[PDB]
Amino acid sequence: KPINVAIFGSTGSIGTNALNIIRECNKIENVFNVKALYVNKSVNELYEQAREFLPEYLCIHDKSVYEELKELVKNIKDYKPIILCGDEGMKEICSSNSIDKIVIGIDSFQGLYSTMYAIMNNKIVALANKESIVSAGFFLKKLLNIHKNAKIIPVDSEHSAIFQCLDNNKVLKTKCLQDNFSKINNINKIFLCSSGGPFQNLTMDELKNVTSENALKWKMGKKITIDSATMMNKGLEVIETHFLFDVDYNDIEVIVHKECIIHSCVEFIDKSVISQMYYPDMQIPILYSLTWPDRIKTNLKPLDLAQVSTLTFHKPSLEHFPCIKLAYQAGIKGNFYPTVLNASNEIANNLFLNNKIKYFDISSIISQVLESFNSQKVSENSEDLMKQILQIHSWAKDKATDIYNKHN
Amino acid sequence: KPINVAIFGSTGSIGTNALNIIRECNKIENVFNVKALYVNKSVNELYEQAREFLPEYLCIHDKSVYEELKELVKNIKDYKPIILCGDEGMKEICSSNSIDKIVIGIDSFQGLYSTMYAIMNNKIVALANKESIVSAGFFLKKLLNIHKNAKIIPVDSEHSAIFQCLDNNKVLKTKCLQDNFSKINNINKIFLCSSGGPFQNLTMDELKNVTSENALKWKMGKKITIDSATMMNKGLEVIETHFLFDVDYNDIEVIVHKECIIHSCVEFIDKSVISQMYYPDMQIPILYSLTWPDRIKTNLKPLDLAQVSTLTFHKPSLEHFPCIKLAYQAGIKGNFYPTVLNASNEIANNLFLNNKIKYFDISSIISQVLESFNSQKVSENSEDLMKQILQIHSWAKDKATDIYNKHN
Ligand SMILES: NC(=O)C1=CN([C@@H]2O[C@H](COP(=O)(O)OP(=O)(O)OC[C@H]3O[C@@H](n4cnc5c(N)ncnc54)[C@H](OP(=O)(O)O)[C@@H]3O)[C@@H](O)[C@H]2O)C=CC1
Ligand SMILES: NC(=O)C1=CN([C@@H]2O[C@H](COP(=O)(O)OP(=O)(O)OC[C@H]3O[C@@H](n4cnc5c(N)ncnc54)[C@H](OP(=O)(O)O)[C@@H]3O)[C@@H](O)[C@H]2O)C=CC1
Ligand SMILES: Cc1ccc(CCCN(O)C(=O)CC[C@@H](c2ccccc2)P(=O)(O)O)cc1
Ligand SMILES: Cc1ccc(CCCN(O)C(=O)CC[C@@H](c2ccccc2)P(=O)(O)O)cc1
Ligand SMILES: [Ca+2]
Ligand SMILES: [Ca+2]
Ligand SMILES: [Ca+2]
Ligand SMILES: [Mn+2]
Ligand SMILES: [Mn+2]
Question: What residues of B are in contact with residue A267 (Cβ under 8 Å)?
């Protein structure tokens, strides 16, 4: 009866939100068993989680805090977890028959490795890490075609919204990333909603001057805050939409909805549009990823639409947010351009965060790396294709850094 | 896999809209066969439709234009339709094995009769007539339990919206007008959107003196236009929601949404809200009733959310729109109070339309009729129950009229 879940990246924003909603859902019935928690190096925070949830498995990626973990955990009475470390630990958890569903709340390109292994073990993968899809979309499709019982269920709020708007009667006959998913689901077009970020109303002159402090001062982590400010977050999410739902780029429309109530919309072939809405929230997306195709009761505050009162929609200016255009261009180009987009953005975003370049330099760097990249034949076997993605990702990060280094 | 459809009330608003969307859809691919048309007295319109759609059956209710119809139809080359008459024509159409779905576009209290025979013959019934559901909900539920393969599919725009927000793998485990429909679909709450009609900004003093002219001068029939002005249309729709979807009255919220883009919204038990949105429209509601659980291509204009730009929501004032409160009160009392509400409103609406009473007299009369009713032993026998509904309807109409005449 209980859904057996692993939380990968349990100490971060997604991971802690997941454990919060699991905690609430488990107050009376045993709805979920938390079988495994995996983090990078937050050994103290992991220990506190282990004390509460008592998972069968604990894993730390950073082997240097393994002893520290082992020692902390001995303090917990009558608890004999399997304590693992690194890639080998990740792979052992993914292999466990006692795990059904894995929440991937690991950030950056790193989250791809666990995603890949979770699919290879025919698990349900509740994927929040959009960089994996953007970097490796075609590769994940291939894997999902081999590993017949694996599924990716989207957790990113807009993709969760789109997924929810679908009719599960059609969803159940396909799965995310599968060729023909949009046909089977009668999808015509997607309205991909965005907050628009902190700089949405600035003039071109004002935008030239913006700093990371101006973006940082809805409270989110730094990387995503900067991506929201440039709208590269939405750019990545366009490519994410295309891969998840097999929707053509020309049928994905970015819409700025600053109230952030409507989380995205699907237009079906009859032109009817379905949308999903709630307060800005990750608990519903995470919960749904674990309960789908069912829903369960929560005690979340009900949406008060009369109090919200007003919902607004407008088209983003691609002159002001050129990251959006770069994302569409890379996605349409296909091949490894999305990998290059993501990698170069990782560098450009961090340069801006750290006050080393200007706002328009972010898109300039990314553009230059994209223009520099030469298309490669797509390796035909899975393990060569993975190595290739890694090659290009690293190449693009280095190229971005080289561009920055040369031009100051 | 052609969809075989009969249109009942084919020359009316619903009927003609149904043929319109069938016509447009069939231009894209021939999915619909119109097998039967049925009208009251519009023999010439009927002839013209018969010319286009070449239905196997034709039926007119009023015996006195039967021969005229037979005459008219002779003109049509290479066409030998079965031409039928009255209550008896309807019964034969509903019994045909070549008809899968019947659109009931017959208005007022009348529409119940053909609904019943459509259900008795295990058809899919596309039902727009909210008054039948409000007045005879308990009878329809009983019929639908006897006739296991019959289904009512809602066409009323808000109810179609609600229905379209659901997962059909769960819908297919139940059917509308069944107990536990909302439980099985994990429905928590409904937002029932309303235009708000022409009087939302009027003061109490202004409402005291509004006339039917002010109500009438979005173009619809007179009766529904007056109901939209008083918001008794929404009150009837609250009860319609309760019966169609088994949603408790305290879990239906009327919200004024004057732009009429979001057609209504379903809050699930996790507090996720899904909504259906389009331009104000009856084509998609009708078409979906006929395609459910699938959708097909249309050439309808795509919603341009950016252009719509702004969507607003507010709570209706019950002091200004007391008909809403009366509908909830009747719904919550249950029994035959909905039958009484509907019947007395039929009279009060017509009184106001004909300048015989004032705006607040509408709710006054309805209130007084409801107060004079006493709950009745609900017959377990289908035949006795229909007679109860007819008797109570007629009683309530006479009572409303008596209250009008006494004060006037
Ligand atoms: N937060 C949100 O609301 C949203 C998140 N997302 C996406 O979800 C992903 C995760 O985001 P978020 O929760 O914000 O990220 P955080 O930075 O808050 O958390 C990252 C988590 O991953 C762990 N981690 C990092 N590297 C490894 C590794 N090698 N092995 C195991 N665990 C590791 C961290 O461990 P430690 O604590 O030890 O560092 C931490 O638990 C991102 O791709 C993000 O874009 C998208 C939509 C919304
Ligand atoms: N369309 C809309 O926007 C909305 C409609 N509705 C509901 O839909 C229902 C239908 O409304 P609408 O189509 O606008 O109404 P109309 O008055 O425009 O249509 C009436 C139709 O019923 C036919 N009819 C009447 N009596 C008989 C009979 N005894 N036998 C056969 N046919 C008969 C009429 O035939 P004839 O032409 O010969 O008189 C005509 O075809 C209403 O109950 C309303 O509440 C709900 C919400 C909005
Ligand atoms: C504290 C908190 C909690 C939950 C959420 C849910 C939105 C999460 N999400 O999917 C994201 O991609 C974040 C970035 C995007 C966004 C979306 C909504 C609000 C603000 C920003 P955008 O790229 O549109 O600017 C947000 C903020
Ligand atoms: C010609 C045409 C065609 C389609 C529509 C769309 C839906 C109509 N519908 O279901 C009704 O109940 C009508 C009355 C209600 C309404 C709803 C939307 C717009 C305007 C009015 P309300 O009770 O909320 O005032 C409208 C007008
Ligand atoms: Ca150490
Ligand atoms: Ca759904
Ligand atoms: Ca297309
Ligand atoms: Mn997102
Ligand atoms: Mn309606």
Answer: 302-303
Tell me chain B's radius of gyration from C-alpha atoms: 21
Tell me the chain B residues in contact with residue A275 when contact means C-beta distances shorter than 8 Å.
262, 274-275, 277
Q: How many CB pairs under 8 A join A and B?
A: 147
CA A172 to chain centre: 22
| Sheet architecture: strand order including B151-154 | B82-85, B57-60, B32-39, B3-8, B101-104, B124-127, B151-154
Distance B255 CA to ligand 9 centre (A): 13
The shortest CB-CB distance from A269 to any of B172, B271, B295 is to B295
- A4 in Cβ contact with A57 (< 8 Å): no
Taking the C-alpha atoms of residue A118 and residue A152, their distance in angstroms, rounded to an integer, is 10
Solved by what technique?
A: X-ray
* Residue B266: closest C-alpha in chain A: A276
Contacts of the segment A143-148: beta carbons below 8 A, 24+ positions apart: A143/A116, A143/A119, A143/A382, A144/A119, A144/A175, A144/A176, A144/A177, A144/A178, A145/A178, A146/A382, A147/A119, A147/A120, A147/A121, A147/A122, A148/A122
Instruction: Please give the C-alpha separations between residue B264 and each of A134, A165, B256, in angstroms, as whole numbers.
Output: 34, 14, 11
Residue A237, annotated as binding a ligand:
yes
Give the Cα separation of B123 and B143 in Å (integer): 12
Closest in A189, A276, A306 to B273, CB measured: A276
Is A228 one of the annotated binding-site residues? yes
> For ligand 3, atom 2, which residue shows the shortest CA distance?
A218
**Which amino acid is present at B225?**
T
Q: List % helix, strand, coil for chain B (3-state, nearest 5).
A: 55, 15, 30
The token pair at A293 is 């195709």
Distance CA B254, CA B324 (A): 9
B279 lines ligand 4 (CB under 6 A): no
Tokens of A237: 């999410």
The finding on whether A283 has its CB within 6 A of some atom of ligand 3 is: no
Task: Decide: B137 and B384 in contact? Cβ < 8 Å.
Answer: no
With a CB-CB cutoff of 8 Å, which residues 179-238 of chain B face chain A? 186, 188-189, 191
A145 is in an annotated binding site: no
C-alpha–C-alpha distance, residues A314 and A258, integer Å: 9
- Alpha-carbon span A27 to A49, nearest angstrom: 16
Alpha-carbon torsion, ordered B244, B246, B248, B252, to 10 deg: -40
Atom 4, ligand 3: which residue's CA is nearest?
A: A281
Whether the CB of B267 is below 8 Å from some CB of chain A: the reply is yes
The domains located in chain B, with CATH, are 2-156 (3.40.50.720), 157-317 (no CATH), 318-408 (1.10.1740.10)
Residue with tokens 């330099």: A361
Determine the Cα–Cα distance for residues A163 and A165; give it in Å rounded to an integer. 5
CA distance B46 to B7: 11
Element (H, E) at B209: none
Which of B327, B304, B356 has its CA nearest to residue B241? B327
Q: Residue holding tokens 């994996």?
A: A132
Residues of A in contact with B300 (CB under 8 A): 270-271
Measure the CA–CA gap between A60 and A81, rounded to whole angstroms.
13
Burial (0-12, 13-18, 19+ Cβ within 10 Å), A237: buried
Q: Is the dihedral of CA B84, B86, B88, B90 positive or negative?
A: positive
